[PDB]
């Protein structure tokens, strides 16, 4: 089985917190993933979110397709729209980004990707927001522990994630309907930290670090991780397990740690029945830049808002959100915000 940890409610930097942080890092370095225990409220909120997702996916496609916005990428993506390593993927997705009203300063100013979630209804909204509040508390604990485990100042990562661009993919994978069962191909996630939850069906596989195996830096053009290793062992089945979430590093943690953590490759196999899952990304602030922690003389950076916006424009090039960015030249706002700051 995967390793399982219980996180303290508060992380203070005591020697035992540092020891736990070291154990989390070791588990990522050995297995690529670990489990964290959920308490009764965390578990209840997870199950409610999955139930809301199932109910929404039963709504007619005409209704689901109306849950879209030209200000934010939040909302519905039909099956077959996302592509991994050139092949369309199978799940239907509702993406929840930061839910900002039109009166928020950033929405008023037209910042790309900022706007109100096009929620299907208030009951779904409440289920997702409550769940994401708990996921965020866990993400902050994890990032303090990770800093401590590397002997870094406790707030090294959480300074970047203040008002972070946290977002969640609420997924339904269809049952297998032919010889094809690649629900999503092998890939690595583009963000900082991933917390994943799933129902009891099963289908997620992850790749641990492999001694001697070359890994691409997926944040760079020309070093895509997509499709790599898909048909070669090892792939660990993430067995559905009551009372846990799983946690793995994304591309930005690989970048910041110089590869001491690797962004965990993962893929999904369609089951013989539908599968519900949620993938939560605990992210830097839209205005924050990731930087190499252990190479002080390296000048490379990842500006998070640019990273996110470019990714979503490339993945959803015909969505009304992308069209409006182009029509109103909203990328110019990112250039402007990068100004008068200390690089």
Could you tell me if residue 75 is left (phi over 0), alpha (psi between -120 and 50 degrees) or otherwise beta?
A: left
Query: In angstroms, what is the minimal distance from the CB of 169 to Mn ion?
Result: 8
Using DSSP, state whether 1 is helix, strand or coil.
coil
Taking each helix axis from N to C end, the angle separating 122-149 and 15-31, rounded to the nearest 10 degrees, works out to: 100
Other beta carbons within 10 Å of 66: 13
Residue closer to Mn ion (CB basis): 36 or 204: 204
Residues near 338 by beta carbon (within 8 Å), at least 6 away in sequence: 303
In the complex, minimum distance from the CB of residue 194 to Mn ion, in angstroms, rounded to a whole number: 7
Lookup: tokens for 83: 């592509």
> Is 277 strand, coil or helix?
strand
Nearer to Mn ion, 143 or 168 (CB): 168
Q: How many residues bind Mn ion (CB under 5 A)?
A: 1
Name which of 20 and 77 has its Cβ closer to Mn ion: 77
Q: What is the DSSP string of 172-208?
A: EEPPP-SS--EEEEEE--SSSEEEEEE-SS--EEE--
- Contact between 89 and Mn ion per CB under 5 A: no
CB of 184 to Mn ion, least distance (A): 7
Residue number of the CB closest to Mn ion reads 189
Q: Which stretch binds Mn ion (CB under 5 A): 6-14, 104-112, 186-194, 205-213?
A: 186-194
**Residues 125-184 close enough to bind Mn ion by CB under 5 A:** none
Tell whether residue 187 is among the known ligand binding residues. yes
User: Which of 88/153 has CB closer to Mn ion?
Assistant: 88
Q: Smaller CB distance to Mn ion: residue 189 or 199?
A: 189
For residues 161 and 285, is the Cβ–Cβ distance under 8 A?
yes
Minimum CB separation of residue 104 from Mn ion in Å reads: 28
167 marked among binding-site residues: no
Is residue 189 within the footprint of Mn ion (CB under 5 A)? Answer: yes
Q: How far is the CB of 187 from Mn ion (least distance, A)?
A: 6
Cβ proximity to Mn ion: between 5 and 205 the closer is 205
Q: Could you give the angle at which helices 320-327 and 304-315 cross, rounded to 10 degrees?
A: 120
> What is the side-by-side strand order in the sheet with 204-206?
182-187, 266-269, 204-206, 236-237
Least distance (Å) from Mn ion to the CB of residue 189? 5
By CB under 5 A, name the binding residues for Mn ion. Answer: 189
Binding residues for Fe cation: 187, 266
Annotated binding site: 187, 266
């Amino acid at each position: 089985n995967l390793q399982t940890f219980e996180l303290p409610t508060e992380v203070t930097g005591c020697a035992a917190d540092i020891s736990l942080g070291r154990a989390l890092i070791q588990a990522w370095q050995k297995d690529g993933i670990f489990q964290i225990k959920t308490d009764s409220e965390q578990d209840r909120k997870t199950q409610e979110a999955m139930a809301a997702s199932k109910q929404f996916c039963k709504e007619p496609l005409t209704f689901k397709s109306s849950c879209v916005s030209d200000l934010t990428y939040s909302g519905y993506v039909a099956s077959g729209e996302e592509v991994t390593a050139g092949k369309p993927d199978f799940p239907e997705i509702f993406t929840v980004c930061k839910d900002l009203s039109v009166g928020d300063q950033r929405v008023k100013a037209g910042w790309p990707c900022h706007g109100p979630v096009p929620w299907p209804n208030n009951t779904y909204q409440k289920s997702m927001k409550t769940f994401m509040e708990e996921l965020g508390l866990a993400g902050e604990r994890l990032l303090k522990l990770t800093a401590l485990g590397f002997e870094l100042p406790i707030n090294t990562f959480t300074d970047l994630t203040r008002d972070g661009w946290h977002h969640m993919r609420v997924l339904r994978f269809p049952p297998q309907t032919s010889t094809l069962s690649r629900g999503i191909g092998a890939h690595t996630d583009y963000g900082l930290l991933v917390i994943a939850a799933q129902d009891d069906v099963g289908g997620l596989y992850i790749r641990p670090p492999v001694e001697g195996e070359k890994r691409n830096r997926n944040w760079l053009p020309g070093e895509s991780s997509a499709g790599m290793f898909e048909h070669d062992e090892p792939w660990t089945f993430v067995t559905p397990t009551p009372g846990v979430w799983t946690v793995f590093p994304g591309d930005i943690l690989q970048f910041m740690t110089g590869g001491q953590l690797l962004s965990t490759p993962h893929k999904v196999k369609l089951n013989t029945r539908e599968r519900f899952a949620c993938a939560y990304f605990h992210e830097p602030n839209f205005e924050a830049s990731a930087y190499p922690l252990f190479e002080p003389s390296a000048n490379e950076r990842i500006h998070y808002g640019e990273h996110f916006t470019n990714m979503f424009m490339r993945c959803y090039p015909d969505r009304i959100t992308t069209q409006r960015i182009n029509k109103e030249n909203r990328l110019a706002h990112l250039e402007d915000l990068k100004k008068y700051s200390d690089t």
